[PDB]
């Protein structure tokens, strides 16, 4: 997706996540893990978030892995 985050989400989203993406650091955009939730809203997670690995595990169990 052609998006560019300058703010990180740190709080764990409560909504179901349907897609995720690893977004790279650029001069304009932060490195973050992009979540698209079931309501089509985007939050780009701080890669340092403590809860993120477990959330990605749960997503993988459901058949959702990040692009």
Token pair belonging to 38: 């079931």
Domain, as residue range, for 11 = 1-67
| Determination technique for this entry | X-ray
Contacts of 8 (CB under 8 A, 6+ apart): 30, 32, 44, 45, 46
DSSP reduced 3-state for 22: strand
CATH of the domain at 38: 2.40.50.40
Cβ-contact 8, 32 below 8 angstroms: yes
Give the experimental resolution in Å. 1.3
Query: How far lies 52's CA from each of 27, 28, 44, 63, in Å?
Result: 24, 23, 11, 16
């Amino acid at each position: 997706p052609g998006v560019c985050f300058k703010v990180l989400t740190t709080k764990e989203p409560k909504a179901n996540i349907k897609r995720c993406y690893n977004l790279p650091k650029t001069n304009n955009c932060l490195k973050c893990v992009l979540f698209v939730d079931a309501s089509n809203r985007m939050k780009c997670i701080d890669p340092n978030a403590s809860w993120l690995a477990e959330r990605l595990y749960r997503l993988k169990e459901k058949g959702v892995t990040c692009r």
